[PDB]
A paper describes a structure:
Fsx1E is a monomer in solution but crystallized as a homotrimer in the presence of 2.5 M NaCl, 0.2 M CaCl2. However, we could determine the structure of Fsx1E at 2.3 Å resolution by running MR with a combination of fragments from ab initio predictions generated by AlphaFold229. Each protomer consists of four domains, the first three of which match the approximate dimensions and relative arrangement of domains I–III of known fusexins in their post-fusion conformation; accordingly, fold and interface similarity searches identify HAP2 as the closest structural homolog of Fsx1E, followed by viral fusexins and C. elegans EFF-1. Fsx1 domains I and III are relatively sequence-conserved among archaeal homologs and closely resemble the corresponding domains of HAP2 (RMSD 2.1 Å over 218 Cα), including the invariant disulfide bond between domain III strands βC and βF23 (C3389–C4432). On the other hand, Fsx1 domain II shares the same topology as that of HAP2 but differs significantly in its secondary structure elements and their relative orientation, as well as disulfide bonds. In particular, Fsx1 domain II is characterized by a four-helix hairpin, whose N-terminal half interacts with the same region of the other two subunits to generate a six-helix bundle around the molecule’s three-fold axis. Notably, unlike previously characterized viral and eukaryotic fusexins, Fsx1 also contains a fourth globular domain conserved among archaeal homologs. In addition to being coaxially stacked with domain III as a result of a loop/loop interaction stabilized by the C5457–C6477 disulfide, domain IV contributes to the quaternary structure of the protein by interacting with domain II of the adjacent subunit to which domain III also binds. The Fsx1E monomer has a net charge of −67, and another feature stabilizing its homotrimeric assembly is a set of Ca2+ and Na+ ions that interacts with negatively charged residues at the interface between subunits.
Numbering used by the authors:
A (entry chain A): 25 to 59, 73 to 508, 537 to 542
B (entry chain C): 26 to 60, 74 to 510, 537 to 541
C (entry chain B): 26 to 61, 73 to 509, 537 to 541
The structure:
């Protein structure tokens, strides 16, 4: 025994147990148990998952499409008001239908009869819900080997997989102590929203929160009601309202969020995403290292040793994607373990040249002898150059094993956001109260002066982003 | 077993040795032997989240408004000046906002002028962002002579207790940092603080969406449009004041619903963000703090560990109806029927089809003969068109270090409705002809009713009904 | 102490042993002894926490543009006007077609009517917006090896690009990162802000307020700008009025940099840290975690380890506090000197605050050399419902604990309430008897005092400048 253990209720903890602290950190460490009678324990496979949930609320009203509803023949103003309250869609969600009414001269039912202008719900596109902060779940598989072959396995987790936080592995016992953090980020759930409908795979879909907000503002804040007033006024026809105005926001709002908007939606098929059928986002990277206490009962005078294989990293290839200003690109490297032993290889970007910034952390992978792994790191690009929209540069990829390392340079290319569309014109009034006109140049980064208008002239739009110097109601006569 | 040296401290120049201890709800007792019944133990732990707020010019005050009208202005400039000086500044540009109209005046020809304005009535609240919280831990360490505690110390990274380092008898305890459990925190981005002496402790948690819509309305132009409509005769002043202008303001100061945020308590017993202390007392532990215990037990002083174990017995189980879009809960009450203190990790180990575990495990320290209750979040999703209620089961597991118990719990899932039974919908088929469908009794599907002729259209009739009408709406024009 | 074996590494095949060390601002030194001297010592010197941010664009985040009006006449038919609007006018709602209004007018030469169009045209792009993503947390920790009193080797460990990375050699020893222990400190809220890309801004982009951008986007694409076209068509506004006062207000507000009060990512003071847009790094003023290390020491067959732990003596030399304004945290600071002869590990904190004041910060531990001084800073929040005093005085206690000794002191703090009203402004309300009452805001800006009740036939009517009057029971131009 290294530290003596006592217990009145457990024979295991009174019988010469000793405690070993082990972190599942992608290392090659093997815990060799000696009673002779060689047994070894090792952590092989690890995974991080994020489990999400959703929340509805009265503030998050349903996404609905609307049609116009018109009827005439009401005898009195009160009749029209009652019909609106009873049979028209409740735009403001106050319990009564919303609508407008107009009186018209009636010889048969004098002095007036009344018309009503209303909406009516056609269909519900989705019930929205907030997306809550996720729980972080780990899994870590521990393996027992008598000799060459694995003879027993156990998977530990703070979630529902495996045997849980404490389990038996042969005659030893493994107990979770908590997780050490790696510094990796989680996806931002606040920019997206959940959309529930049986039309969607698994019954719901991830939407963009801004689109939903704009829909809600439009339908419930008065703009839809203003469309009813405009229809009543003759500014719009009923067909115009229905076809072009009233449902645009709803129909945009139920679209799935773009992959650029959130890591919770996969761009490519192989990329991970938030599975709406399981509420799980399987992070491509480890977010923490779980730490364990291993209680080993190896009898009287039983001891432990550690076997640590080491490998040799060899970079086989490198690649990079175009980095577009405003979105991070990627630098990738394929690394092979050319050594005879298992390796623990930490890949990272160690530098990037001017204009390029590393916006990622390192990643460590367990690599078997003769096997290969691929690394991927996020690189961001920014520039204020007015001369070149495309800029070439370099970043350094480094992979460190425990014993040896390898590094190489990787070319990267940055693409600026355009400042203007080539050929488009812009106008400006100077301190001398005179208008100036400029044209966007071919590189989409600068404007070049064209002309300054005279004192009595003004720079006036001509359509298709053109302006001209000139020294608006014919229907008003 | 490791020698410590120091020129400035006699404590660290003596025969001290360092022990690593994590406050993890275990039963471990650190037995101290001089060369004698002394034991050190961690008994009670708590996690708290401390919040703050941030104001900003962008977050304008929540105010209610009335209309302001006056006439008799002699010139257009007089009216403009009066508006700039005496009217509410809707757009926050330093000058009052308003509209003016000229009217024929014999006494002051050619015209006099009216003004249409708002005026502030009351300030309902000053809004503020809610910041990310600091996570505070407390952990109580006890020193026992025999079975009785002779000294206690509370360690914390906040204001409670003695802080991160304290003396406990002849020993010293030093915080090293916290190990993470993976549990989530509440989402502060959905909510805002609303400051007013009308509110308990001077502020309240509001819904951020409601405030955003209020701000959009008052400062984005819609209130100004109400002034234009009042000027035009579309509305009267009374209508504006009573039904239009203050609706968003009054909605925005309402407290956020419990469904919106964990920071507002559903039940009296449930925790929430106390506005009088800025503290949210999390119902579960968020991390395990790690400590170094420096023991000075003389020249030949050594340590042992005593580890009691218990026996989990599930006494009862419970579950709430799970409504699609909001997680429900499955609960279990567990008794320690053994003779020793226990460390019981509860979890859900599985759920049947349609149900997803969206929670992590919970570990509780349970005294002999005592009972604790666990609670885990379960989410439900379905695309069935045949059944609104779906039954299933989840498995609750409780693992002690030595033994375990498990049981199954029935759960019921309820879908969101896709439509209201009896409501109708209209659609144009592939043959460019209108079709009408009726929502079925189960509120999940629509069934075909009829197809309109080519010259006909599916036209709303009020109360969610449609009819085919020949196409061949302004009697007041 | 623990036997190691390896077929591929000579370092791990001998009699190396592993030491667990956390870079936690302590004074601990790992003293290495060969045989059973040759004293080598390892210590961690400098640590830092940084947050690395990135951005994300999206079709939903449309460009921030300024607009002008575009008018043209002479179109022969309604269809000509419709096509011209779709082809040559700015697409307000981003549906692929230009947006605009048209009006018919009597034409003698082209009967019966010709047509006018009312449109917007893009003038300039002010910025391309992007979301700001959650950051990665990067640590650096410097390890030093000293022979005698001289440092002979240094190594910097990190989970990012600095130093040698997660594993490095230090002399004959090896240091391996195991992960970080969390301190509980908060990170800035990225959801309140947005990135604004333009070569007009330092390093090509700027941190903006997300609410301002949201309002701009709602206005331009949600119909309000289109309503301005309708109003211009109606004669309610002129083209010059639209252009100069209405259409570009939200865009120009949206490109302003976020205020320091909105986000910690924008520095209040010049010396205060912020999200550097040229490097995407926010250097947090405090440590966010303690990195944990395994140190493999190969000290031969009889090599052993000892720890030397210096201790200091805290002495508070000064304190300070800022005015705490209800709704924003203020700060309490203390300057502490180590008046002892040895290096110290000093944990500063606020241990209490009086009524109305709440500590909303965690402790801070700093390594302080003998004779050196450090300053601590802690956030304190203030809230009150007092109707009598806008200013409330109180106190907080600053405590600094070394490993061996401690010091404490009281710091005066001042809380300022938000005003409930502006003095002199009036308010109106209907009582249980459905009759109007008028109240005036008092000099302290917290309460209203009753002034008068209007008669049954009267109403409390606005009169300008926040005043109300009772008037008997509004369109002369109709
Ligand atoms: Ca292995
Ligand atoms: Ca996985
Ligand atoms: Ca929820
Ligand atoms: Ca009639
Ligand atoms: Ca459907
Ligand atoms: Ca609007
Ligand atoms: Ca939209
Ligand atoms: Ca990143
Ligand atoms: Ca990463
Ligand atoms: Ca640029
Ligand atoms: Ca106990
Ligand atoms: Ca508590
Ligand atoms: Ca703040
Ligand atoms: Ca006059
Ligand atoms: Ca009030
Ligand atoms: Ca509203
Ligand atoms: Ca959860
Ligand atoms: Ca939980
Ligand atoms: Ca469903
Ligand atoms: Ca030092
Ligand atoms: Ca720094
Ligand atoms: Ca991104
Ligand atoms: Ca014509
Ligand atoms: Ca054209
Ligand atoms: Ca520019
Ligand atoms: Ca909005
Ligand atoms: Ca604005
Ligand atoms: Ca002192
Ligand atoms: Ca804080
Ligand atoms: Ca802090
Ligand atoms: Ca107050
Ligand atoms: Cl309805
Ligand atoms: Cl994301
Ligand atoms: Cl959210
Ligand atoms: Cl879908
Ligand atoms: Cl819509
Ligand atoms: Cl999107
Ligand atoms: Cl390796
Ligand atoms: Cl005012
Ligand atoms: Cl929440
Ligand atoms: Cl926020
Ligand atoms: Cl309240
Ligand atoms: Cl309002
Ligand atoms: Cl709410
Ligand atoms: Cl137990
Ligand atoms: Cl354009
Ligand atoms: Cl912040
Ligand atoms: Cl965001
Ligand atoms: Cl700038
Ligand atoms: Cl704008
Ligand atoms: Cl701001
Ligand atoms: Cl100290
Ligand atoms: Na928002
Ligand atoms: Na509108
Ligand atoms: Na994963
Ligand atoms: Na570097
Ligand atoms: Na022209
Ligand atoms: Na008056
Ligand atoms: Na205290
Ligand atoms: Na320590
Ligand atoms: Na309106
Ligand atoms: Na708690
Ligand atoms: Na399971
Ligand atoms: Na009809
Ligand atoms: Na408007
Ligand atoms: Na820092």
């Amino acid at each position: 025994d290294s530290i003596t253990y006592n217990s009145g209720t457990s024979e295991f903890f009174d019988g010469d147990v000793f405690a070993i602290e082990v972190t599942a950190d992608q290392s090659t460490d093997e815990i060799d148990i000696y009673l002779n009678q060689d047994l070894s324990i090792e952590f092989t496979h690890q995974d991080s998952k994020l489990k999400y949930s959703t929340s509805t609320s009265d503030e998050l009203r349903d996404i609905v499409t609307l049609t116009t509803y018109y009827e005439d023949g009401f005898d009195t103003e009160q009749d029209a008001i009652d019909a609106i309250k009873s049979d028209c869609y409740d735009l403001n969600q106050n319990g009564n239908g919303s609508g407008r009414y107009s009186r018209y001269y009636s010889v048969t039912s004098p002095v007036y009869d009344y018309e009503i202008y209303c909406f009516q719900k056609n269909e519900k596109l989705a019930t929205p819900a907030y997306i809550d902060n996720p729980d972080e779940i780990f899994t870590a598989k521990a393996e027992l080997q008598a000799g060459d072959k694995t003879i027993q396995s156990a998977t530990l987790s703070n979630g529902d997989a495996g045997d849980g936080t404490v389990t038996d592995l042969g005659d030893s016992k493994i107990s979770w102590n908590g997780n050490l953090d790696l510094g990796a980020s989680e996806p931002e759930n606040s920019r997206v929203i959940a959309l529930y409908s049986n039309d969607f795979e698994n019954g719901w879909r991830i939407g963009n929160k801004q689109s939903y907000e704009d829909y809600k503002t439009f339908i419930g804040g008065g703009d839809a009601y203003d469309l009813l007033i405009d229809w009543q006024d003759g500014t719009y026809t009923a067909s115009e309202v229905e076809d072009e105005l009233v449902n645009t926001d709803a129909n945009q709002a139920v679209e799935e969020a773009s992959s650029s908007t959130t890591d919770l939606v996969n761009a490519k098929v192989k990329d991970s995403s938030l599975d709406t059928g399981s509420f799980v986002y399987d992070t491509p990277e480890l977010l923490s290292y779980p730490s364990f206490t291993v209680y080993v009962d190896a009898g009287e005078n039983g001891y432990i040793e550690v076997t640590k294989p080491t490998g040799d990293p060899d970079i086989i290839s490198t690649s990079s994607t175009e980095i577009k200003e405003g979105d991070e690109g990627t630098v990738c490297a394929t690394v092979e373990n050319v050594g005879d032993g298992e390796g623990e290889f930490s890949g990272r970007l160690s530098s990037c040249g001017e204009g390029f910034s590393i916006v990622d952390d390192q990643n460590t992978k367990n690599v078997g002898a003769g096997e290969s792994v691929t690394y991927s790191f996020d690189v961001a690009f920014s520039s204020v150059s007015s001369e070149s929209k495309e800029i070439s540069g370099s970043c350094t990829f480094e992979v460190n094993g425990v014993e040896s390392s390898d590094s190489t340079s990787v070319s990267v290319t940055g693409i600026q956001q355009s400042e203007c569309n080539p050929g488009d014109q812009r106008r400006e009034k100077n301190e001398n109260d005179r208008w100036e006109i400029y044209t966007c140049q071919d590189n989409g980064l600068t404007y070049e002066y064209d002309v300054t208008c005279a004192e009595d002239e003004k720079a006036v739009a001509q359509g298709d982003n053109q302006f001209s110097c000139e020294k608006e109601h014919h229907h008003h006569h």
